């Protein structure tokens, strides 16, 4: 009934970077949180950025600050990943969350995508 | 950052033979924390949730428990598709962070 | 028209009588001075405000961070006892209408909307660049927005006054406090009423002036 | 009332202080009235009339001040009626739509007592 | 239909109970409990306590302590009631000593008598206790936020004085707080909204 | 500015200095009095005032006969001899022109146009809603609007003052009136110079009050 959909990879070059889609269906969407996570195939976690779906009130961490940017959209119910100026170094599997009222939780998941980047 | 500590980050384990890991955090986080499981296929699930509590639809034999000062993961029986990657998460203050995690090994010849 | 001089500037003002005291004080001396190192009104970038503009806040000395003489000895002393003059000023036309609720909340502690997550350090200090309210009828700290007005406050109304000066003295439990940690006071922009005019959108500028007036500094270091 | 709601019998003198947010050149008047406790609440405006009231206008004074004489309550008496005088005018340049803010506080005769718990868990 | 009591000091103070725990006790062939005696955890005291920011008080603690049955009849056991100020580190080598230190106050008391009532005075380092703190634990930049180090009263720890008794009686014990001499400045407006969690200000809505 | 108040209420006014006295006097009494019972101003319904507003009119006391508190003692009583204190206060921008001549004719005998027949009682006494001038240039008794300035009557110039103050003495050859019968004075509301404004057409309200002031009652019944 509900689920989480990020299909696909999208391999780009350094100059410009796509932009991540993340739908939902199953629960309302203007009542939940939205998350994001980074997997590295360094075996690296390191955690993106949350944006509430109300509000554009977003938090971003102090490495990935100025980088990445969060925006969404209650019509179509999906939340979308804003980056500029992706080099060779970064490359991993983006992943969204939910969370909610109680215990912001991380329960469903994405599918997650291939990002591969060469000069 | 605060830094949420994993240890060990590898073990060796045959079927059976429950083993607790513990993770440590430089500031209290209260009972806020999250444990998640990670398959080689890239899908991530959650397993244990604010200590005691655990996942509707997820067998009884994960567990965990708090001494106070640490937080452990406690599995009873393990399996052959036991062997991910655990990690330790603490949503109670932004920003988020990832413990070190552990690979669960076989033991072979 | 009166001309308030502080220092070696000053700024073209309303006429000032009976400004409001917070809670019926001035900040006097704990029973060197910075009358004139760290002295004259530092004014802030002003915000465009419009009629979806849910407000803004500006906690202290957080704007301060580092701003002009003041950002040097943030850094640079151990403790300090700071009192705040805060002038307000919005211009504006006559043709314009709506109202701004210039109120002072000392520690106001911030809050989420639907989730148990603290914010985080950059969340909360934000620097000179300031937040924006969140759901400024919640203030953001769980309470409501009617019974706020316990706080010092003034009105800022495009028909009678369009400026508004607050004077906070130093307000903590200890003598002294930490420069880059705790926050005494915050200074809060509230528009009750939004704009409205003929033309479908307008901007109305906004200007803060903030005088660490009658402080002190201690543990002399670097 | 936050406060009163940790108390039960309440006694005193309230007031009411009516604040006009809208433009500069906003035309027109309008009334104000208070209803006796079992006071026959207006249909439209003469009975409103019989009792305490006043003529307020934008142009000239840019608040109210009402001073309601001694309300009482414990554990439909009261009321507070509104109505337009003229019509509102404004040019054309303002703004069609303004507002207001109301406002209430406590006299020096306001008194409180009888300790409870609030009603309110949340 | 138709100033004394509105004081502050009558107002805040009123005997409510902050700390309902009941250890299970039938056959152990252990038995304590420490909490950090806070107000944000009973709701109404909270609440009753958000309305002003800094107050000043002496906390007034009383232990009442019943015994439920799970005809054998009640024994008298002892208990112990420490007050462990902040700052003692609790290496905790249970059946030997730290509990008898001479350091903490402690109090005796039996099932049948008076409930055991104390007064702890006012310890801090400033002025008066925060009630919001606007700022970071310590300073670790990044260190917790919406808890001040500055302010801790203690940890009560409460024991049986008795070893095991072979009874299957449950011992439930409740602790009442009153203020005295309470001093109240800046009041705040009240929170309508639910309170999420203990730690912080969030809000749902 | 100056709120003028008379019994439990009152209404917001311009300054009011050098008010005008009909005939140079004022309504002493005569050589229980209302100052509690019928008192406080009666504010009458506002007329919606166009470019092609003729006028209104409205009798003394035609337009109290059941007005408030001041209703009852109409049919209640036998005699009477009351004064009359009328400020109209018309509300408008800068933006709009014209004039408003505020004149109170004592004795004022109506007539038709191109008839013999007298009116009748109903189109005499109209009560609170008022009349509307059918010629006012005539004045509708067949004088001269020219020489009706030799009346007491005050000027609204939308340049200069908004409002008028009229009072108005016990003018009659006996000393006590019928309440449903004579009408002593007449109010009536001149628009020499009509509205004009950049829009075809607008409105503009007029506030009409009227104070009984230093009256008297006699023959008790009902």
């Known amino acids: 009934q509900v689920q989480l959909q990020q299909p696909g990879a999208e391999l780009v070059m350094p100059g410009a970077s796509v932009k991540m889609s993340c739908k939902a269906s199953?629960?309302?969407?203007?009542?939940?949180?939205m998350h994001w996570v980074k997997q590295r195939p360094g075996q690296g976690l390191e955690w993106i950025g949350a944006?509430?779906?109300?509000?554009?009130?977003?938090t971003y961490n102090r490495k990935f600050k100025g980088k990445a940017t969060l925006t969404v959209d209650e019509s179509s119910s999906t939340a979308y990943m804003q980056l500029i100026s992706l080099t060779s170094e970064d490359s991993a599997v983006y992943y969204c969350?939910?969370?909610?009222?109680?215990?912001?939780?991380?329960?469903?998941w994405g599918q997650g995508t291939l990002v591969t980047v060469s000069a | 950052d605060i830094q949420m500590t994993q240890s060990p980050s590898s073990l060796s384990a045959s079927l059976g033979e429950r083993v607790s890991l513990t993770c440590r955090a430089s500031?209290?986080?209260?009972?806020?924390l999250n444990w998640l499981q990670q398959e080689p296929d890239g899908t991530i699930k959650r397993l244990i949730y604010?200590?005691?509590s655990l996942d509707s639809g997820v067998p009884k034999r994960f567990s965990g428990s708090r001494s106070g000062s640490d937080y452990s993961l406690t599995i009873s029986s393990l399996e052959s598709e036991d062997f991910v990657d655990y990690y330790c998460?603490?949503?109670?203050?932004?920003?988020?962070?990832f413990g070190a995690g552990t690979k669960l090994e076989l033991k072979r010849a | 028209v009166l001309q308030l001089k502080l220092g070696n500037s000053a700024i073209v003002t309303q006429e000032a009588a009976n400004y409001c005291c917070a809670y019926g004080e001035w900040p006097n001396y704990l029973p060197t001075q910075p009358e004139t190192a760290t002295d004259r009104f530092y004014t802030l970038k002003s915000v465009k405000w419009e009629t979806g503009s849910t407000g803004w806040w500006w906690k202290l000395p957080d704007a301060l961070n580092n701003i002009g003489m003041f950002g040097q000895n943030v850094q640079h002393h151990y403790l300090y006892r700071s009192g705040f003059l805060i002038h307000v000023q919005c211009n504006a036309t006559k043709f314009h209408q709506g109202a701004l609720l210039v109120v002072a909340i000392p520690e106001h502690q911030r809050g989420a909307h639907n989730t148990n997550t603290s914010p985080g350090f950059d969340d909360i200090m934000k620097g000179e660049e300031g937040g924006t309210f969140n759901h400024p009828y919640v203030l953001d700290d769980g309470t409501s927005l009617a019974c706020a007005t316990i706080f010092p406050h003034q009105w800022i109304n495009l028909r009678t006054n369009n400026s508004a000066t607050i004077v906070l003295p130093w307000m903590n439990a200890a003598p002294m406090d930490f420069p880059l940690r705790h926050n005494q006071w915050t200074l809060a922009i509230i528009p009750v009423v939004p704009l409205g005019t003929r033309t479908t959108s307008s901007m109305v500028p906004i200007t803060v002036s903030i005088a660490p007036m009658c402080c002190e500094f201690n543990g002399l270091r670097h | 009332g936050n406060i009163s709601r940790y108390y039960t019998h309440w006694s005193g003198s309230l007031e009411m202080t009516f604040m006009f947010c809208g433009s500069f050149m906003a035309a027109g008047k309008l009334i104000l009235c208070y209803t006796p406790p079992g006071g026959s609440c207006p249909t439209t405006r003469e009975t409103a009339m019989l009792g305490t009231h006043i003529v307020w206008d934008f142009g000239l004074q840019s608040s109210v001040t009402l001073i309601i004489p001694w309300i009482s309550g414990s554990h439909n008496v009261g009321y507070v009626t509104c109505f337009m005088q003229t019509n509102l005018i404004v040019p054309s340049e303002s703004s069609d739509t303004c507002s207001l803010i109301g406002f209430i506080a406590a006299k020096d005769d306001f008194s409180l007592r009888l300790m409870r718990d609030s009603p309110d868990i949340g | 239909t138709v100033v004394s009591e509105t004081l502050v000091e009558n107002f805040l103070s009123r005997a409510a109970l902050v700390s309902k725990r009941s250890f299970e006790y039938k056959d152990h062939t252990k038995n304590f409990f420490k909490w950090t005696i806070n107000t944000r955890s009973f709701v109404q005291l909270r609440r009753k306590l958000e309305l002003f920011t800094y107050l000043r008080f002496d906390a007034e603690i009383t232990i009442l302590t019943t015994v439920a049955v799970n005809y054998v009849g009640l024994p008298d056991l002892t208990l112990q009631a420490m007050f462990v100020p902040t700052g003692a580190l609790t290496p905790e080598k249970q059946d030997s000593f730290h509990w008898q230190s001479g350091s903490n106050a402690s109090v005796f008391f039996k099932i049948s008598d008076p409930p055991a009532r104390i007064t702890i005075p006012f310890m801090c380092i400033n002025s008066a206790y925060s009630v919001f703190y606007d700022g970071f634990a310590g300073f670790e930049k990044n260190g917790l936020y919406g808890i001040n180090p500055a302010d801790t009263i203690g940890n009560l720890c409460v024991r049986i004085v008795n070893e095991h008794q072979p009874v299957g009686f449950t011992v439930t014990v409740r602790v009442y707080m009153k203020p005295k001499h309470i001093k109240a400045w800046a009041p705040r407006p009240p929170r309508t909204l639910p309170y999420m969690s203990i730690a912080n200000a969030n809000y749902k809505g | 500015v100056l709120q003028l108040k008379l019994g439990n209420s009152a209404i917001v006014t311009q300054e009011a200095a050098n008010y005008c006295c009909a005939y140079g006097e004022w309504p002493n009494y005569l050589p229980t009095q209302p100052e509690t019972a019928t008192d406080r101003f009666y504010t009458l319904k506002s007329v919606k005032w166009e470019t092609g507003s003729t006028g209104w009119w409205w009798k003394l006391p035609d337009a109290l006969n059941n007005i408030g508190m001041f209703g009852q003692n109409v049919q209640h009583h036998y005699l009477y001899r009351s004064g009359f204190l009328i400020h109209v206060q018309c509300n408008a921008t800068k933006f709009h022109q014209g004039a408003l001549l505020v004149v109170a004719i004592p004795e004022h005998q109506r007539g038709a146009h191109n008839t013999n027949t007298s009116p009748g009682f109903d189109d005499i006494m109209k009560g609170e809603e008022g009349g509307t001038f059918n010629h006012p240039y005539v004045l509708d008794d067949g004088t001269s609007l020219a020489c009706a300035t030799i009346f007491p009557h005050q000027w609204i110039n939308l340049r200069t003052n908004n409002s008028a103050t009229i009072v108005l003495p016990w003018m009659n050859a006996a000393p006590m009136d019928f309440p449903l019968r004579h009408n002593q004075w007449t109010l009536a509301i001149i628009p020499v110079v009509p509205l004009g404004t950049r829009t075809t057409s607008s409105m503009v309200p007029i506030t009409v009050s009227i104070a009984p002031m230093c009256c008297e009652f006699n023959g008790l019944r009902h």
């Open positions: 969350a939910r969370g909610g009222g109680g215990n912001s939780p991380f329960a469903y």
């Open positions: 500031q209290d986080i209260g009972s806020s």
């Open positions: 604010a200590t005691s």
């Open positions: 998460l603490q949503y109670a203050s932004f920003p988020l962070t």
């Open positions: 944006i509430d779906t109300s509000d554009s009130y977003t």
């Open positions: 199953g629960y309302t969407f203007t009542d939940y949180w």
